[PDB]
Amino acid sequence: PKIHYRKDYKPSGFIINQVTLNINIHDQETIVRSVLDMDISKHNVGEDLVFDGVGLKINEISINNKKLVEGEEYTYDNEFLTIFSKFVPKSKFAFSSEVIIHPETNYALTGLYKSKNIIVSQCEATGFRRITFFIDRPDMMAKYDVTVTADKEKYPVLLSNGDKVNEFEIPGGRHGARFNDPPLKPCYLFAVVAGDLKHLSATYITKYTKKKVELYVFSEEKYVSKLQWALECLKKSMAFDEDYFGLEYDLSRLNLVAVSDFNVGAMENKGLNIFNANSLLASKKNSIDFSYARILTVVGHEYFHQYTGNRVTLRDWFQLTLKEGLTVHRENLFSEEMTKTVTTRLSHVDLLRSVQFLEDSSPLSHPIRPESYVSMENFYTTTVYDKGSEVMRMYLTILGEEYYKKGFDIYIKKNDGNTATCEDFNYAMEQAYKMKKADNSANLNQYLLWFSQSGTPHVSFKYNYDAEKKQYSIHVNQYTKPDENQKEKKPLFIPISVGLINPENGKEMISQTTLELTKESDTFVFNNIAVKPIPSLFRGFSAPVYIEDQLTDEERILLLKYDSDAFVRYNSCTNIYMKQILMNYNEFLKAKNEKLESFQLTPVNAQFIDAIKYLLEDPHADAGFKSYIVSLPQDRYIINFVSNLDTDVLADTKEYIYKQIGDKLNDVYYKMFKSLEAKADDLTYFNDESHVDFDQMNMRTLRNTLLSLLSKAQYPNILNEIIEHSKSPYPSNWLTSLSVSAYFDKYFELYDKTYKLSKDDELLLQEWLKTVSRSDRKDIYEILKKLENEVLKDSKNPNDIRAVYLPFTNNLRRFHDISGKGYKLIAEVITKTDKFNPMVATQLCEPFKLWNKLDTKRQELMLNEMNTMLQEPQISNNLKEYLLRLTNK
Ligand SMILES: CC(C)(C)CC(=O)N[C@@H](C(=O)NO)c1ccc(-c2cc(F)c(F)c(F)c2)cc1
Ligand SMILES: [Mg+2]
Ligand SMILES: [Mg+2]
Ligand SMILES: [Mg+2]
Ligand SMILES: [Mg+2]
Ligand SMILES: [Mg+2]
Ligand SMILES: [Zn+2]
Numbered sequence: 060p061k062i063h064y065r066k067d068y069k070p071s072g073f074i075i076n077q078v079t080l081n082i083n084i085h086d087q088e089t090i091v092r093s094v095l096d097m098d099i100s101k102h103n104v105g106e107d108l109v110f111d112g113v114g115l116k117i118n119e120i121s122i123n124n125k126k127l128v129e130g131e132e133y134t135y136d137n138e139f140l141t142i143f144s145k146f147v148p149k150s151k152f153a154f155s156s157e158v159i160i161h162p163e164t165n166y167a168l169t170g171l172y173k174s175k176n177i178i179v180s181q182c183e184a185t186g187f188r189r190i191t192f193f194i195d196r197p198d199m200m201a202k203y204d205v206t207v208t209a210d211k212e213k214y215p216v217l218l219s220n221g222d223k224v225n226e227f228e229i230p231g232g233r234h235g236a237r238f239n240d241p242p243l244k245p246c247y248l249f250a251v252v253a254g255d256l257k258h259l260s261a262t263y264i265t266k267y268t269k270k271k272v273e274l275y276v277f278s279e280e281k282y283v284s285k286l287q288w289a290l291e292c293l294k295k296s297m298a299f300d301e302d303y304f305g306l307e308y309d310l311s312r313l314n315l316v317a318v319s320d321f322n323v324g325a326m327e328n329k330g331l332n333i334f335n336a337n338s339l340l341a342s343k344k345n346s347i348d349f350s351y352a353r354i355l356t357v358v359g360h361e362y363f364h365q366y367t368g369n370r371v372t373l374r375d376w377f378q379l380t381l382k383e384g385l386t387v388h389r390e391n392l393f394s395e396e397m398t399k400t401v402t403t404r405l406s407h408v409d410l411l412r413s414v415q416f417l418e419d420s421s422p423l424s425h426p427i428r429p430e431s432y433v434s435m436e437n438f439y440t441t442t443v444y445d446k447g448s449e450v451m452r453m454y455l456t457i458l459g460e461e462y463y464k465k466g467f468d469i470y471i472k473k474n475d476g477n478t479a480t481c482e483d484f485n486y487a488m489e490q491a492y493k494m495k496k497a498d499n500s501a502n503l504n505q506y507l508l509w510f511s512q513s514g515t516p517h518v519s520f521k522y523n524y525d526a527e528k529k530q531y532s533i534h535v536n537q538y539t540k541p542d543e544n545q546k547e548k549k550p551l552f553i554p555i556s557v558g559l560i561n562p563e564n565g566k567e568m569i570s571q572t573t574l575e576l577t578k579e580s581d582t583f584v585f586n587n588i589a590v591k592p593i594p595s596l597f598r599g600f601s602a603p604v605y606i607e608d609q610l611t612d613e614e615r616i617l618l619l620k621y622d623s624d625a626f627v628r629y630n631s632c633t634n635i636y637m638k639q640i641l642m643n644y645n646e647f648l649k650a651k652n653e654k655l656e657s658f659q660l661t662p663v664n665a666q667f668i669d670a671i672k673y674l675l676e677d678p679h680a681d682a683g684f685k686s687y688i689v690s691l692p693q694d695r696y697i698i699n700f701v702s703n704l705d706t707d708v709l710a711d712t713k714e715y716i717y718k719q720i721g722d723k724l725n726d727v728y729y730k731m732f733k734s735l736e737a738k739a740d741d742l743t744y745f746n747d748e749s750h751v752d753f754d755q756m757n758m759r760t761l762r763n764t765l766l767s768l769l770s771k772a773q774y775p776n777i778l779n780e781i782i783e784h785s786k787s788p789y790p791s792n793w794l795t796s797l798s799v800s801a802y803f804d805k806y807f808e809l810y811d812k813t814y815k816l817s818k819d820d821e822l823l824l825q826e827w828l829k830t831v832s833r834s835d836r837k838d839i840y841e842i843l844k845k846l847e848n849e850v851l852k853d854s855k856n857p858n859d860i861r862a863v864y865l866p867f868t869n870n871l872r873r874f875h876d877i878s879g880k881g882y883k884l885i886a887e888v889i890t891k892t893d894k895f896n897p898m899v900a901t902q903l904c905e906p907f908k909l910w911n912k913l914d915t916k917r918q919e920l921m922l923n924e925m926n927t928m929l930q931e932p933q934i935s936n937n938l939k940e941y942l943l944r945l946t947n948k
Pocket of ligand 1: 181184185323324327334364435437898
C-alpha cells in the first residue's frame with residue numbers, strides 16, 4: 060500500500076494550464092474527451108509523464124494530435140497512465156484522450172455516477188481521475204472549458220462550473236451545453252450535473268459592489284416543494300459573510316443541487332454545490348425539526364468554502380483542516396448568530412467531547428494535520444473537522460473579535476487566488492497577535508503544536524484564597540497522554556476563558572479574562588477579591604480539553620444555578636452526573652464481580668435534584684438548556700472515563716440514576732410536558748417554509764425528552780399522552796410517539812401508523828427507519844430483520860443503510876449483547892456494503908472505534924469480527940487500511 064508523507068511534498072514537474080472537456084452521456088456508457096494544454100515546470104527533471112486515471116477504458120490518447128501506442132510509448136495499469144519521458148515534449152504541448160466510463164454502475168458514488176435519474180459527480184479528494192486522466196492533486200490549478208451532451212428528454216438540465224456560454228441541439232434527440240470557467244481551480248472542485256431538475260430561484264444583491272447574483276436550488280420534480288428553506292439559508296449565509304467578514308460572492312450565479320445518493324452531507328464545487336438531499340430538502344409536514352438546523356449548517360458550510368477552500372485552496376491534502384476546520388468554525392459562528400440559542404454551541408461541544416474525544420483516545424488518534432495517509436477517503440474525520448474547528452475558534456478567543464477579523468482579512472487578502480498551508484493561516488493570526496500585544500516580538504510558534512500533536516489535553520486546577528489579603532489563585536496544569544504519534548507531548552498554548560462568581564449573590568467578580576496557559580503549569584493570581592469565589596472555567600468551552608474542575612458538587616450546583624456562561628453551567632451539570640455515574644458504576648461492578656447477594660448504591664445528590672427542579676420550573680429559563688440538564692451525558696462521553704467498560708453495568712447505572720431522579724421529579728416533568736404544549740406545537744406558521752423558530756423547536760425537544768423519561772418510567776396513564784402525541788402534525792412529535800411507545804403494547808400499532816405517514820417521502824421514510832432502529836425494544840433484532848426484509852432490501856442508497864443500522868449501534872444494552880450477535884450483524888453489513896461502497900463501509904465501522912475500551916469479553920468479540928472482516932479476500936483498500944489501524948496491526 061502506498062503511503063504519502065507530509066514531509067515529502069514537492070511541486071510537480073508539469074503544469075496543466077487549460078482543460079477542455081466533452082462529456083457525452085449515453086444510455087450504457089459515458090464518453091469523455093479531454094484536451095489538456097500543458098507545460099514543463101521549473102521542477103522538471105526529465106521524468107516520465109504520469110497521470111492518475113482510475114478505471115478508465117482508453118479509446119485513444121495523443122500528444123500534439125499524434126496518437127500514442129500502448130507498450131512502446133505508454134503503459135496503463137488502471138491506476139496510472141505512464142508516458143515515457145522520451146515521448147514527452149520539452150515545451151508547451153497538448154495531451155488529449157478519449158475514455159469510456161460507466162456512471163450507471165458506479166455505486167461507490169465517487170467520480171461520475173447516477174443517483175436515481177440524475178447524473179452527478181463527486182471529485183473531492185481524488186475522484187476527478189475516475190472521470191479522465193489528470194495530475195490529480197490540488198496544487199495543479201487550471202482553467203476549464205466543459206461541454207456536456209445528453210438525451211434531452213432524460214436530461215434537460217445540464218450544469219457545470221462557470222458561465223453557460225452555449226446551448227445547442229444535436230441530432231437524435233440530444234442536446235449540449237458549454238460552460239467556461241476561466242478562474243484557476245483545482246480539479247477536486249470540478250462538477251457536472253445532468254437531469255430532469257426543477258428549481259426555485261432568487262436574486263441576491265451584494266452589499267458593497269452591488270453585484271446581482273442568481274441563486275438556484277434544484278431537486279427532482281417530486282420534491283421541488285422542499286427547496287424553500289435551503290434558498291432562505293443561502294441568502295442568510297451570503298449576508299453573514301458580508302456582515303461579519305466583509306466578504307462578497309464573486310460569481311454571477313450559484314447553484315445548489317440535491318441528489319438522493321451521497322456519501323456525506325454536501326460538497327462545495329465552485330458555483331455548483333451538490334448536497335445529500337437530507338441536507339438540502341425539508342418541509343414542515345415531511346421533515347423532523349433537526350432538518351432545519353442541518354440544512355442551515357450545511358448550506359452555510361458549503362457557501363463559506365467559496366473563500367476558505369475555493370478562492371484560497373490547499374497546497375496538498377495534508378492541509379485539509381485549513382479549509383475544513385476553518386469552514387466548520389465559520390459555519391458555527393453563522394449558526395450561533397442565526398439560531399440565537401445557547402444550545403447551538405452546546406450541541407457542538409456535546410459532539411466533540413463524545414465522538415471526537417473517543418477518536419482521539421482510540422488507535423485511530425491523529426493530529427488535525429496528519430503526517431501520512433494511505434486512503435484520502437479515510438482522512439475526512441471528526442478530528443480534522445471538529446477538533447480543527449475548535450483550533451480555528453481558539454484564535455478568535457485569543458485575539459478577540461476585532462483583532463480576529465483583522466487577522467482573518469490578512470489571511471484572505473494575502474492568499475486569495477492561491478494554494479495555502481496551515482502555516483499561512485497561523486502567520487496571519489500571528490500578525491494580528493503582535494498588534495493586539497503591541498509587541499512585534501510576540502509570536503504564535505507554540506500554537507503550531509495544535510496542528511501536529513494528537514491526543515486530548517487534560518487541564519486540572521487547584522485553588523487558594525487568602526481572606527486577609529483578598530488574594531485568589533488558580534493553579535493550572537496541562538497534560539497530554541503519550542500515544543503512537545508522540546512519545547513526548549509538549550505543552551500547548553491553551554486559552555482559558557474564566558469568570559469568578561461571588562457565591563453569595565451570583566455576580567461576576569472580574570471582567571472578561573482569558574488566561575493564556577503556555578507552560579505545563581502556571582499559577583494565576585487575582586488581587587482585590589473580596590470573598591472566596593467559585594471559578595467559572597473554560598467559558599464557552601474555550602479549548603478542546605478534558606476539564607478537571609476540582610470543584611465540589613455544592614460549588615457545581617451554585618454554578619449550574621447562577622453562573623452567566625451556558626457552557627460552564629452545562630459542564631458543571633455534566634461533572635455532577637459523571638461523579639455519580641462513576642461511583643454507581645463501581646458499586647454495580649463490584650456487586651457483579653463479587654456475586655453479592657446484597658449491596659448498597661450511593662443515591663443521587665438531593666441538592667442536585669432540587670437544582671434541576673429549580674431550573675425546570677423557571678419560566679424565564681431556556682427550553683433547550685433544560686433538555687440537556689435532564690439528560691445523562693452521552694455514552695461515548697462516559698466511556699472516555701472508564702477502563703474495561705462493562706456496557707451492561709453502565710446500562711444498569713444509567714437506569715438507576717434516571718429512576719432516582721424521576722422518582723423525585725416525574726410530576727414536574729408531566730406538568731411541564733402539558734404546559735409547554737401550546738407554544739411548542741403552535742401551528743400558526745406550519746404552512747410557511749420561510750418561518751423557522753429555533754426556540755419553538757427547542758420547546759419540542761424538551762417535550763419529547765420529558766415524554767421519553769415519563770414513558771420509560773411508566774408514569775400513570777402516560778400512554779394516553781403518547782397516543783395523542785401520535786396525532787400531532789409535526790414529524791418530530793409523531794416519530795417521538797413511535798419510539799416512546801416501545802415501552803407499551805401499542806408499539807406495533809404506532810409502527811404501522813407512522814410507516815404509512817412516512818412511506819411516500821424518501822427522506823421521511825429514512826427518518827422513520829432511524830426511529831425504528833433506535834427504538835428501545837427487547838425484540839429489536841427481530842425488528843431489524845423485518846426492516847431488512849420489508850423496507851431496506853438490497854438498497855445501495857447510503858442514507859437507507861445508515862438509517863437502518865447506525866442508530867441501533869447506540870443501543871447500549873442490545874447492540875452490545877454479550878453473545879456478540881450485534882457485532883456479527885454490523886460486520887456482515889460492513890462487508891456487504893464494502894463490495895460496492897468502501898467509503899460508506901468504513902462509516903459503518905463506527906461502533907468498533909471503542910473496542911479496546913470495553914470489558915475483556917466484548918473486546919475479544921469485537922476483535923474477532925474485525926479480524927473476520929480483515930480476512931475477506933475482496934476487502935477494499937479503504938476498509939483494510941482502516942481496520943488495520945484500528946486493530947493496531
Ligand atoms: C457538512 C459536514 C461538514 C457536517 C459533513 C460533510 O458533508 N463534509 C463534506 C464537506 O466538507 N463539505 O464541504 C465532505 C465533502 C466531501 C467528502 C468526500 C471525501 C472523499 F474522499 C470522497 F471520496 C468523497 F466521496 C467525499 C467528505 C466530506
Ligand atoms: Mg471503468
Ligand atoms: Mg445585508
Ligand atoms: Mg456542522
Ligand atoms: Mg495566592
Ligand atoms: Mg430510494
Ligand atoms: Zn467542507
